[PDB]
Amino acid sequence: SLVMSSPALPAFLLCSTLLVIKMYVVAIITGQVRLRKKAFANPEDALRHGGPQYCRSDPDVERCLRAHRNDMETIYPFLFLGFVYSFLGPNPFVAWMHFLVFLVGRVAHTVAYLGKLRAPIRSVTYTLAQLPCASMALQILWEAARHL
Amino acid sequence: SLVMSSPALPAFLLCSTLLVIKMYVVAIITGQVRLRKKAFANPEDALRHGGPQYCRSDPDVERCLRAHRNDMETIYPFLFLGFVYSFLGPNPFVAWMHFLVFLVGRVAHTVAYLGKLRAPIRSVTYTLAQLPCASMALQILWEAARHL
Amino acid sequence: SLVMSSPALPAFLLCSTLLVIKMYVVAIITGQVRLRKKAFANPEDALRHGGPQYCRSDPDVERCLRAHRNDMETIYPFLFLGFVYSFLGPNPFVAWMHFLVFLVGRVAHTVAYLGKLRAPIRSVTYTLAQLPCASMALQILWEAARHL
Ligand SMILES: CC(C)(C)C(=O)NCc1ccc(Cl)c(C(=O)Nc2ncc[nH]2)c1
Ligand SMILES: CC(C)(C)C(=O)NCc1ccc(Cl)c(C(=O)Nc2ncc[nH]2)c1
Ligand SMILES: CC(C)(C)C(=O)NCc1ccc(Cl)c(C(=O)Nc2ncc[nH]2)c1
Ligand SMILES: CCCCCCCCO[C@@H]1O[C@H](CO)[C@@H](O)[C@H](O)[C@H]1O
Ligand SMILES: CCCCCCCCO[C@@H]1O[C@H](CO)[C@@H](O)[C@H](O)[C@H]1O
Ligand SMILES: CCCCCCCCO[C@@H]1O[C@H](CO)[C@@H](O)[C@H](O)[C@H]1O
Ligand SMILES: CCCCCCCCO[C@@H]1O[C@H](CO)[C@@H](O)[C@H](O)[C@H]1O
Ligand SMILES: CCCCCCCCO[C@@H]1O[C@H](CO)[C@@H](O)[C@H](O)[C@H]1O
Ligand SMILES: CCCCCCCCO[C@@H]1O[C@H](CO)[C@@H](O)[C@H](O)[C@H]1O
Ligand SMILES: N[C@@H](CCC(=O)N[C@@H](CS)C(=O)NCC(=O)O)C(=O)O
Ligand SMILES: N[C@@H](CCC(=O)N[C@@H](CS)C(=O)NCC(=O)O)C(=O)O
Numbered sequence: 001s002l003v004m005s006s007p008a009l010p011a012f013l014l015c016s017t018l019l020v021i022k023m024y025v026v027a028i029i030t031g032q033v034r035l036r037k038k039a040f041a042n043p044e045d046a047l048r049h050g051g052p053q054y055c056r057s058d059p060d061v062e063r064c065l066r067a068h069r070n071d072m073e074t075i076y077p078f079l080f081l082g083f084v085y086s087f088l089g090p091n092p093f094v095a096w097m098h099f100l101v102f103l104v105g106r107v108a109h110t111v112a113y114l115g116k117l118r119a120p121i122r123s124v125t126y127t128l129a130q131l132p133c134a135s136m137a138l139q140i141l142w143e144a145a146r147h148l
Numbered sequence: 149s150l151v152m153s154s155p156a157l158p159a160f161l162l163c164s165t166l167l168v169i170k171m172y173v174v175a176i177i178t179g180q181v182r183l184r185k186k187a188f189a190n191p192e193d194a195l196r197h198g199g200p201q202y203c204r205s206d207p208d209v210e211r212c213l214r215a216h217r218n219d220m221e222t223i224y225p226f227l228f229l230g231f232v233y234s235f236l237g238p239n240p241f242v243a244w245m246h247f248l249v250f251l252v253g254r255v256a257h258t259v260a261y262l263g264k265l266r267a268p269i270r271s272v273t274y275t276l277a278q279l280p281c282a283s284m285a286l287q288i289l290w291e292a293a294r295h296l
Numbered sequence: 297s298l299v300m301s302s303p304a305l306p307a308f309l310l311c312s313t314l315l316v317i318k319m320y321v322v323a324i325i326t327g328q329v330r331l332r333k334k335a336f337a338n339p340e341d342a343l344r345h346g347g348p349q350y351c352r353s354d355p356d357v358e359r360c361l362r363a364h365r366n367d368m369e370t371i372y373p374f375l376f377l378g379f380v381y382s383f384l385g386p387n388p389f390v391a392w393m394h395f396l397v398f399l400v401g402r403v404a405h406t407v408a409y410l411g412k413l414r415a416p417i418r419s420v421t422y423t424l425a426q427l428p429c430a431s432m433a434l435q436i437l438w439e440a441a442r443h444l
């Protein structure tokens with residue numbers, strides 16, 4: 001198998017795929033909140049589900065969208081950075097720690113966001129998860145630059 | 149060529165690249181709608197194109213933005229999942245079917261969204277396209293876990 | 297090192313990683329503007345930082361969000377396209393030029409957007425940066441199709 005290309009790769013692929021699934025869960029939650037609160041973005045959706053007055057914004061829907069957007073602002077870069085980083089021959093335990101901190105940080109972020117936990121709990125989880133991303137980015141920069 | 153690294157890779161690269169181009173088309177459509185409806189997000193844009201009153205929201209512009217955002221919520225994960233999945237030695241025909249269902253589902257989604265087709269046509273196309281993504285995610289999880 | 301897999305790869309990894317860091321800078325700027333202008337998206341954030349009246353929109357915050365979103369609409373596709381393109385054996389100088397035009401175009405885009413430069417400066421930087429992306433997409437299409 002080509003997953004054995006690098007010692008850190010399986011750990012990366014596990015954490016990244018779990019986080020993609022976690023984003024899919026947010027998407028599903030968003031849809032279920034739209035239906036339960038009857039708050040649709042489109043008139044065609046609203047007319048199917050009770051009438052044109054249900055084409056409206058809702059605070060819980062907007063919150064779900066913000067969590068999903070923040071995921072796109074953070075998890076997508078990790079998908080790129082963590083993949084490249086996996087092939088730079090990092091220490092397996094150190095790599096594991098990078099991936100685990102991001103995984104735990106991001107899962108905690110979604111729980112804090114959707115669960116409406118007091119500030120700055122969500123903010124701290126964002127910063128915590130950004131740390132391994134910043135670390136990997138710098139390491140990729142050094143490897144790329146030295147190979148020019 | 150390194151496209152011959154795996155039998156499923158060319159099919160993946162064709163479908164993914166077509167979908168990226170499809171996202172670029174949505175971006176172009178969005179810009180053209182902004183100009184035609186004179187609905188700009190920025191005062192500097194508005195002042196160039198008729199005056200400050202044209203810094204305003206528009207339902208068709210917002211619809212275009214929603215289609216583009218939904219693309220980012222779905223196609224970007226596919227770019228990651230489908231790439232990794234291509235290297236897991238899946239059955240070539242089965243892999244083809246995963247990529248084709250996503251491609252057809254997503255193109256149909258954009259047509260349904262921008263064309264304002266009746267509910268739940270758009271919703272169904274989203275769910276249909278998510279199926280192969282869910283499938284690939286699970287398969288990656290198993291391969292990653294078994295290599296830890 | 298696996299960065300020596302293709303002659304164009306180090307150039308790609310340098311430009312892409314710089315652009316991811318550039319997106320992180322936009323995220324940080326956004327947060328700092330929220331705090332300085334006291335414009336928070338969440339009631340829990342607002343109550344921590346002065347009261348419920350500070351859960352409000354702000355034009356500068358919205359501008360930052362638009363720049364970040366446009367980055368997601370353009371840089372993320374480049375991360376995929378440029379990576380694949382790096383392995384298609386392109387002319388090293390030609391590949392360099394693709395990556396440099398995108399890097400300069402996108403950095404200029406963020407400066408033009410956040411700096412509120414007159415139209416159509418921002419619009420032109422977007423189009424300029426899309427050119428190498430369009431080029432790479434077509435090249436990937438040809439390579440993928442010919443390997444089917
Ligand atoms: C799980 C997910 C699809 C994300 C969701 O809950 N979306 C909310 C949602 C929003 C607007 C509409 Cl119109 C529907 C709808 O009716 N859908 C449908 N009807 C029959 C089959 N499918 C659903
Ligand atoms: C195709 C795409 C670029 C996505 C589009 O249609 N954007 C809408 C758009 C929005 C605001 C402005 Cl200010 C312009 C504009 O004037 N642009 C320009 N002028 C000269 C060269 N370029 C265009
Ligand atoms: C740099 C970045 C994190 C992106 C930023 O400036 N965010 C703005 C922001 C928005 C809402 C809140 Cl509630 C905070 C906050 O208090 N955060 C915090 N307190 C203690 C530790 N961390 C910050
Ligand atoms: C990956 C998906 C994680 C979903 C986490 C959802 C956390 C729900 O948490 C709930 O939030 C409610 C407010 O939204 C509160 O009223 C409840 O007390 C709380 O249990
Ligand atoms: C947003 C603020 C994050 C700052 C923390 C930076 C993360 C540290 O990252 C470290 O950088 C060093 C120098 O590049 C490298 O030698 C290490 O391998 C790397 O772990
Ligand atoms: C990848 C880009 C696909 C673009 C699909 C656009 C579909 C346009 O479809 C059009 O939508 C209009 C409302 O928006 C309707 O008035 C028209 O009847 C319909 O033909
Ligand atoms: C959103 C709901 C989607 C549920 C459909 C799941 C897609 C099925 O996916 C299947 O999963 C099996 C077990 O992991 C694997 O053995 C198969 O290879 C895979 O095709
Ligand atoms: C990657 C991050 C790039 C940040 C570029 C910020 C450019 C700031 O530019 C500033 O913009 C202000 C309006 O916003 C103007 O009042 C100032 O004249 C101008 O210097
Ligand atoms: C948005 C408008 C962009 C149009 C510019 C297209 C970029 C040109 O791209 C070129 O395409 C040729 C044919 O596919 C290839 O032979 C070249 O390698 C490629 O550089
Ligand atoms: N787009 C973000 C940029 C800054 C950011 O990612 N902040 C973190 C920590 S405060 C966050 O959880 N933001 C909430 C959000 O993105 O909706 C924002 O507007 O807040
Ligand atoms: N962000 C999505 C999450 C759920 C989703 O992706 N739903 C599908 C099927 S109903 C969709 O086409 N949503 C429309 C959209 O994202 O604008 C939303 O708010 O609806």
Ligand SMILES: N[C@@H](CCC(=O)N[C@@H](CS)C(=O)NCC(=O)O)C(=O)O
Pocket residue numbers: 175176178179189213216362363365366369418419420422423
């Ligand atoms: N989502 C974009 C699609 C078109 C686009 O990317 N336009 C460029 C050049 S005018 C841009 O800088 N748009 C500003 C933005 O996305 O906020 C939009 O609404 O404008």
